[PDB]
Amino acid sequence: MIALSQFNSLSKDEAAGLLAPCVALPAWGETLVSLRPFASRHALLQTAREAMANWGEDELNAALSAHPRIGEKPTGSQAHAALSRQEQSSVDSENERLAQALREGNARYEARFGRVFLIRAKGRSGEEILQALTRRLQHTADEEVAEALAQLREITMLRLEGAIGE
C-alpha cells in the first residue's frame, strides 16, 4: 500500500500507473487522479464508486480483453498476474473433475456471451464459482451484462482498497 498523503502528492502519470492494475479502463483512473487531493480514503472510495456507476457493456468488454479465466492461473511477477493468482487462491487446481468443469464452463460461457467469464474470485472455492457459472449460463444477454458489471465493480474496489491506504 501507499498512504493517502503519498497518493495525493504523486505525479499524474505515477498516480495513473498505480491505479491502472485495479481495472483495464483508463477513463476511470484518469477521473480519480484528476480529483486529487482527496479528503480521506473514505472520500476516494466513494468517488471511485461514482466513477463506475455509468459503466455499460462497452466498458465490460474492454475491461475483460485480457482478463485471466478461472482455473487458468497466470504466471509473472507483475501486478496483473499476481492479483489474479491471489484472487483465485481458493480454487483447488488438483480437483480434476472441477478443473475440467471450469474449462468446459468457460468455453460454454464465451460461446454464449462473447467474453471471458468474470467473477469476484476472492474467498470463493472452485465449486462456488462453478455454481455461479452454471447459474449465469441461463441469463439473458442483458441480465448477464448487469451481473458481470456488478462483479467488475467489486473486483475494482477490492484492488483499490489494497492499493491505497489511509
Short mmCIF file of C-alpha atoms in Angstrom, two decimals:
data_model
loop_
_atom_site.label_atom_id
_atom_site.label_comp_id
_atom_site.label_asym_id
_atom_site.label_seq_id
_atom_site.Cartn_x
_atom_site.Cartn_y
_atom_site.Cartn_z
CA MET A 1 0.00 0.00 0.00
CA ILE A 2 0.85 3.68 -0.31
CA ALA A 3 -0.60 6.24 2.12
CA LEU A 4 -3.34 8.64 1.01
CA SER A 5 -0.98 11.60 1.56
CA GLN A 6 1.58 9.89 -0.70
CA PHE A 7 -1.07 9.20 -3.37
CA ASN A 8 -2.23 12.83 -3.17
CA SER A 9 1.29 14.12 -3.94
CA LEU A 10 2.25 11.78 -6.83
CA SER A 11 2.67 12.96 -10.43
CA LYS A 12 -0.37 12.41 -12.68
CA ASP A 13 1.46 9.64 -14.57
CA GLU A 14 2.71 7.80 -11.46
CA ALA A 15 -0.74 8.04 -9.83
CA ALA A 16 -2.38 6.70 -13.02
CA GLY A 17 0.15 3.83 -13.17
CA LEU A 18 -0.69 2.95 -9.57
CA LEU A 19 -4.45 2.83 -10.33
CA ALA A 20 -4.10 1.02 -13.69
CA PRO A 21 -3.98 -2.56 -12.24
CA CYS A 22 -7.36 -2.07 -10.49
CA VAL A 23 -9.26 -2.22 -13.81
CA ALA A 24 -8.40 -2.06 -17.54
CA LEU A 25 -10.27 1.23 -18.10
CA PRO A 26 -8.16 4.43 -18.46
CA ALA A 27 -11.08 6.87 -18.06
CA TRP A 28 -11.77 5.50 -14.56
CA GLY A 29 -8.23 6.06 -13.24
CA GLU A 30 -7.87 9.41 -15.02
CA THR A 31 -11.02 10.73 -13.29
CA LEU A 32 -9.69 9.75 -9.84
CA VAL A 33 -6.19 11.13 -10.48
CA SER A 34 -7.67 14.49 -11.57
CA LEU A 35 -9.78 14.79 -8.39
CA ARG A 36 -6.78 14.80 -6.02
CA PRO A 37 -6.15 15.74 -3.29
CA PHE A 38 -8.76 13.54 -1.62
CA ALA A 39 -10.03 14.49 1.85
CA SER A 40 -9.92 10.87 3.05
CA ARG A 41 -9.70 7.25 1.89
CA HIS A 42 -13.48 7.22 2.56
CA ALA A 43 -13.85 10.08 0.04
CA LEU A 44 -11.59 8.33 -2.50
CA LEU A 45 -13.62 5.11 -2.37
CA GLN A 46 -16.93 6.99 -2.70
CA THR A 47 -15.62 8.96 -5.71
CA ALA A 48 -14.36 5.66 -7.17
CA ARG A 49 -17.84 4.11 -6.79
CA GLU A 50 -19.48 7.08 -8.54
CA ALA A 51 -16.91 6.92 -11.36
CA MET A 52 -18.02 3.35 -12.18
CA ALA A 53 -21.78 3.99 -11.88
CA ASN A 54 -22.26 4.51 -15.64
CA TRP A 55 -20.27 1.51 -16.91
CA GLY A 56 -22.03 -0.46 -19.65
CA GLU A 57 -21.30 -3.43 -21.92
CA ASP A 58 -18.65 -1.42 -23.83
CA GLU A 59 -16.65 -0.89 -20.61
CA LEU A 60 -17.28 -4.51 -19.57
CA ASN A 61 -15.88 -5.98 -22.79
CA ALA A 62 -12.92 -3.56 -22.87
CA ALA A 63 -12.02 -4.35 -19.24
CA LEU A 64 -12.10 -8.12 -19.89
CA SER A 65 -9.91 -8.03 -23.02
CA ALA A 66 -7.06 -9.78 -21.18
CA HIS A 67 -8.78 -10.98 -18.01
CA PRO A 68 -7.50 -14.41 -16.85
CA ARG A 69 -10.05 -17.24 -16.99
CA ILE A 70 -10.99 -19.01 -13.74
CA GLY A 71 -8.87 -22.17 -13.48
CA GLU A 72 -6.14 -20.58 -15.58
CA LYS A 73 -3.73 -19.11 -13.02
CA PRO A 74 -1.39 -16.71 -14.87
CA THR A 75 2.40 -16.56 -14.47
CA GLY A 76 4.51 -13.44 -13.89
CA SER A 77 5.58 -11.15 -11.04
CA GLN A 78 3.54 -8.23 -12.46
CA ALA A 79 0.51 -6.74 -10.65
CA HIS A 80 -1.97 -8.07 -13.25
CA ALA A 81 -0.86 -11.71 -12.86
CA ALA A 82 -0.14 -11.65 -9.11
CA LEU A 83 -3.55 -10.18 -8.19
CA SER A 84 -5.33 -12.84 -10.28
CA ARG A 85 -3.47 -15.72 -8.58
CA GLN A 86 -4.16 -14.16 -5.17
CA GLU A 87 -7.86 -13.82 -6.04
CA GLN A 88 -8.12 -17.38 -7.41
CA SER A 89 -6.25 -18.83 -4.39
CA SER A 90 -9.33 -20.71 -3.12
CA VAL A 91 -9.77 -22.67 -6.38
CA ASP A 92 -8.47 -26.24 -5.97
CA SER A 93 -6.37 -26.90 -9.09
CA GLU A 94 -5.81 -30.58 -8.21
CA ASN A 95 -9.52 -31.50 -8.44
CA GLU A 96 -9.64 -32.92 -11.98
CA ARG A 97 -13.46 -33.05 -12.21
CA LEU A 98 -13.68 -29.41 -11.12
CA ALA A 99 -10.84 -28.22 -13.39
CA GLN A 100 -12.48 -29.87 -16.42
CA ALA A 101 -15.91 -28.49 -15.48
CA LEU A 102 -14.39 -24.99 -15.31
CA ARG A 103 -12.68 -25.36 -18.71
CA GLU A 104 -15.93 -26.62 -20.28
CA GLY A 105 -17.93 -23.96 -18.41
CA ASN A 106 -15.66 -21.13 -19.57
CA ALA A 107 -15.85 -22.37 -23.17
CA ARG A 108 -19.66 -22.54 -22.98
CA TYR A 109 -19.86 -19.02 -21.49
CA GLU A 110 -17.59 -17.46 -24.14
CA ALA A 111 -19.54 -19.19 -26.93
CA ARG A 112 -22.80 -17.85 -25.46
CA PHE A 113 -21.91 -14.29 -24.38
CA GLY A 114 -18.76 -13.45 -26.39
CA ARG A 115 -16.47 -12.53 -23.48
CA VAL A 116 -14.43 -14.13 -20.69
CA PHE A 117 -16.47 -15.23 -17.66
CA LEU A 118 -15.87 -12.70 -14.87
CA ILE A 119 -16.37 -13.36 -11.15
CA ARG A 120 -15.01 -11.79 -7.95
CA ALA A 121 -12.91 -14.84 -7.09
CA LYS A 122 -11.60 -13.71 -3.67
CA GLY A 123 -12.80 -16.10 -0.96
CA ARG A 124 -14.66 -18.38 -3.39
CA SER A 125 -13.94 -22.08 -3.87
CA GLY A 126 -13.93 -23.58 -7.37
CA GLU A 127 -17.29 -25.17 -6.54
CA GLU A 128 -18.93 -21.83 -5.66
CA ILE A 129 -17.57 -20.30 -8.87
CA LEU A 130 -18.75 -23.28 -10.96
CA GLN A 131 -22.25 -22.99 -9.42
CA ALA A 132 -22.31 -19.26 -10.21
CA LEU A 133 -21.09 -20.02 -13.75
CA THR A 134 -23.80 -22.66 -14.23
CA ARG A 135 -26.48 -20.26 -12.91
CA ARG A 136 -25.26 -17.36 -15.08
CA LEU A 137 -25.30 -19.51 -18.25
CA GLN A 138 -29.12 -19.31 -18.08
CA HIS A 139 -29.17 -15.48 -18.06
CA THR A 140 -30.38 -13.32 -20.92
CA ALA A 141 -27.66 -11.17 -22.53
CA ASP A 142 -28.80 -8.08 -20.58
CA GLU A 143 -29.10 -9.90 -17.23
CA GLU A 144 -25.55 -11.23 -17.58
CA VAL A 145 -24.12 -7.83 -18.57
CA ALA A 146 -25.59 -6.45 -15.32
CA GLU A 147 -24.15 -9.17 -13.05
CA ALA A 148 -20.77 -9.19 -14.83
CA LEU A 149 -20.51 -5.42 -14.30
CA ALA A 150 -21.55 -5.83 -10.66
CA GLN A 151 -18.70 -8.32 -10.21
CA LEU A 152 -16.27 -6.00 -12.05
CA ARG A 153 -17.16 -3.16 -9.66
CA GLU A 154 -16.47 -5.43 -6.65
CA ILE A 155 -13.07 -6.54 -8.02
CA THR A 156 -12.07 -2.96 -8.88
CA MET A 157 -12.92 -1.69 -5.38
CA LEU A 158 -11.08 -4.55 -3.64
CA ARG A 159 -7.97 -3.80 -5.73
CA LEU A 160 -8.22 -0.05 -5.00
CA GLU A 161 -8.66 -0.80 -1.27
CA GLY A 162 -5.49 -2.92 -1.49
CA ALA A 163 -3.60 -0.21 -3.40
CA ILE A 164 -4.21 2.97 -1.35
CA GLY A 165 -4.02 3.36 2.44
CA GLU A 166 -5.43 5.91 4.91
#
